[PDB]
Design a protein around this ligand. Structure first.
Ligand SMILES: Nc1ncnc2c1ncn2[C@@H]1O[C@H](COP(=O)(O)OP2(=O)OP(=O)(O)OP(=O)(O)OP(=O)(O)O2)[C@@H](O)[C@H]1O
Length: 124
């Protein structure tokens, strides 16, 4: 199957652009990464840093996860991210998103051996 680490890469990694490509970015990316096939995923974040930089977060600041588990980590540096949020116009499967660029610390949940990101928890 798709591993949880690979699913994190598909849902959350976009190292090829420095920032949010355009006002079209989320519309295109939510579709191309398969986040609109079963339903419009309501919110989702993409990180514009190298895979190694995001993986390194699993050894950075340990913080509680929103679900109460203890395996979340906050990046020491700010990272370039793009938040995608479903609009009102949006009706599946013509899912429509607002694209917002930001520079924030990311919080990811990590699991496994090797210990790698498997869930995007928050940005702060
Ligand atoms: N401390 C944790 N460690 C490992 N996994 C966790 C943890 N805390 C929540 N999780 C997972 O977070 C899911 C949220 O279920 P949800 O309905 O939101 O679909 P998701 O696609 O959307 P999310 O944006 O939250 O998240 P993600 O896009 O990244 O993808 P994930 O596959 O993680 O979830 C839960 O089921 C768990 O597997």
């Amino acid at each position: 199957k798709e591993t949880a680490a690979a699913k994190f890469e598909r849902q959350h990694m976009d190292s090829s652009t420095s920032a949010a490509s355009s006002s079209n970015y989320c519309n295109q990316m939510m579709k191309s990464r398969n986040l609109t096939k079963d339903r419009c995923k309501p919110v989702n974040t993409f990180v514009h840093e190298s895979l190694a930089d995001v993986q390194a977060v699993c050894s950075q600041k340990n913080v509680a996860c929103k679900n109460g588990q203890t395996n979340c980590y906050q990046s020491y540096s700010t990272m370039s991210i793009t938040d995608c949020r479903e609009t009102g116009s949006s009706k599946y499967p013509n899912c429509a998103y607002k694209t917002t660029q930001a520079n924030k610390h990311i919080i990811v949940a990590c699991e496994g051996n090797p210990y790698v990101p498997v869930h995007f928890d928050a940005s702060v």
